[PDB]
Design a protein around this ligand. Sequence first.
Ligand code: MG
Lengths: 65, 459, 121, 28, 35, 181
Amino acid sequence: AVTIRTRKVISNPLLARKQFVVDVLHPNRANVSKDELREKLAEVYKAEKDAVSVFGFRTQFGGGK
Amino acid sequence: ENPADKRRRLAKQYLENLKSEADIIASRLKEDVAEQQGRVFRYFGDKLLISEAKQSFTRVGENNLTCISCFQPVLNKYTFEESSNGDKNKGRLFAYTVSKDLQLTKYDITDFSKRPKKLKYAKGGAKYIPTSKHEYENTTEGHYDEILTVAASPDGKYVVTGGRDRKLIVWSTESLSPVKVIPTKDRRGEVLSLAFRKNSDQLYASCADFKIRTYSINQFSQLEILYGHHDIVEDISALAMERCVTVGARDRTAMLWKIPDETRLTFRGGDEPQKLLRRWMLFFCEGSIDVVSMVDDFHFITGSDNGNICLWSLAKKKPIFTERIAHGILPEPSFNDISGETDEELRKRQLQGKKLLQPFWITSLYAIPYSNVFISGSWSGSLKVWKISDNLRSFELLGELSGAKGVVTKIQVVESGKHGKEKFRILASIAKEHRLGRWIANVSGARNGIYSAVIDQTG
Amino acid sequence: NPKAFPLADAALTQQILDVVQQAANLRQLKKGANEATKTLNRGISEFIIMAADCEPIEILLHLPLLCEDKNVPYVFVPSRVALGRACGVSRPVIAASITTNDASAIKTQIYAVKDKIETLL
Amino acid sequence: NILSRFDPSPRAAKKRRPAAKGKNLSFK
Amino acid sequence: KNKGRISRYLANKCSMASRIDNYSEEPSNVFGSVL
Amino acid sequence: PRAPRTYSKTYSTPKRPYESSRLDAELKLAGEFGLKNKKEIYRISFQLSKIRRAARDLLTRDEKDPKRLFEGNALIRRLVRVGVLSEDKKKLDYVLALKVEDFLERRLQTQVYKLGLAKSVHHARVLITQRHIAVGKQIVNIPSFMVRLDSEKHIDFAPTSPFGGARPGRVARRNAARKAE
Ligand SMILES: [Mg+2]
């Protein structure tokens, strides 16, 4: 399974959005594509997929996160 | 007849029932969501009648009954549908027990007046030993080594067991049929305790490789491993939040895990008899913490091998209150067994006064969620009921129940009746041996069975 | 005066049982009076732990004699139920022996308890 | 045991708790 | 082979009995009986 | 242009590399701890020289001097945390008594050998470089990694390792496939 967690959430109405750090646990898996992460974040935040933008993902040394 | 209309109907019927049962309505509606606020909101310790409790001991054929887990359906305020898996099991209370005989048994405990009734069981044995000898191939349907723990899913659809064979088998409640096997994939990853997140499908498993594993039973998948304990994680407790609390035995530490935040809080006792004796002007040093139960999302209690029951707060690293030698001291060894000399006075000297005396261990410790009363267990021969102070800074001995005779390996509580008037049924698994090992000398009169006590509230 | 002597206090008993558990994990522990006796004969014992509540106490009183002849520290703990549990086995243990190893990962911890036991004797 | 003056010298805005918290979900 | 097991088993008990005799000022026979 | 990035050398060549006693000491050290070359020994000696020179300068200062208290406490805490300095020797006088072996015993290679996960220091080095060892949840592939007191009890085989519960490596499954065929 793949776990997605969000932390350090800032509501930024100056840019009309919410900003956060995304942690992905993906044991026994290379990594999670930005598209599928966008789909799941849209699901959990109850927003359209077009309103979600994810970037800057670095896999930890040793893998799995 | 839109879904919005259906909820309105059910919500309207719920209010009408609340009017019939009865300021009072507004207060009762708040209590429906008091659980979301992780505070104690069930003050019924004074209303409990321990003295008039109806005790009963049910014998079982299994040897060394190791753990018990009870399932109680709860009405969901959001959907107004009961947690029972099917219509047949509406308002049916179940208990699941596991033993070192490799048997999983389910009982019916709906009728508080009647004894537990066996329904189905599943037994393991040597047929289930894996041939591969590889950890990731330890996927056999039954158990072949001691079962140490069991937990019933809050949705009433699965019961999960684990023990010394390093597997996590999830069984169907109706038939006790295995539906998935999840190896821990470690050479020393023996499962020592299981705790479901309240009203959730998230499971926490504390293992002997010093790690905690978390699962999603609906997805049948492992999610993460938690690290930090320096010895075996013996017990684990969870509440509605994702904040499980664990104890580590000989490392003498309790850890609270904030799963979303990926942080942990470490709690340590730090008592030393010299100061305890001085402030007084028998005190035993703690060796290991064996049991833990969360009173609250912000408070929990622990029991040590020196008989200390401590109360903890998330704010403070040290205990806020301690109850030393909660269950008393073990009987002194017989002078006819201490030595082989004929002269009695010589034998008496080998007892060395009171230096060989040691306290009873707290083998079980259960706190009713978000209440002010909790129950402790040992092999003293009684279950002690304690009440926590209103400010949550202390606790006192509410009473005792002497029916149990043997090692109390696990304790559970189930309630029935209207909101105002609840009868509480205490179910404890009783063994002739400690769950983790065969160290304890045979206790006179101890039997393997299910201890039961029904308590009613009046005042 | 009593046969089981010296008996460690509560604080020292926990410190002793701490070292016993670590030595168990590192394969540096010999459990049982028979195995403890062999270590003394081979001179590979760092010190001996005994249970004072043994029934009868006499079945382990050969060990202090061997120790005092070999100048090996020894100490008594109150409980064999606790000693066996910390030894890592599922049964009570009346005697245990820490095996000598100057290349061990717990060398500093072992010598700390050994120094206190010499003070006790 | 017996053994046992004149001193010459607006508030800041109160801290607001975070409006949003972390969210978690698992799949597959 | 079953004969060897008893002989080893009896030897262990004999070792225990000799200790109760040697390290007791006035040994009894109570433990030897149960042994 | 963009600001400079700082860097430094982590070692220094000894005063007289060709002394027979020095060569024999280096032989014994590299053999006992499984070191690759003399540069690792030089690196550790360089660190220890800096530490002991700092302790010497602090000891020259008056007791209760603010600089002495502050920097000596920081140095003692660091040495105790890394495990080189014992909890019962929290003084600069014992800082001056430290030796290279105290630092070499804290290397992850030595700890992996001593905890029993490897049969020698060289097997320990091979296990570390081959991604078989984890400190807590983190795979560490650096043999010179310095283990802390708290980290000591968390050294284990990694979850991804064939020795840690994962599937066998390429060699094992290749052999199994050919045997089945
Ligand atoms: Mg790999």
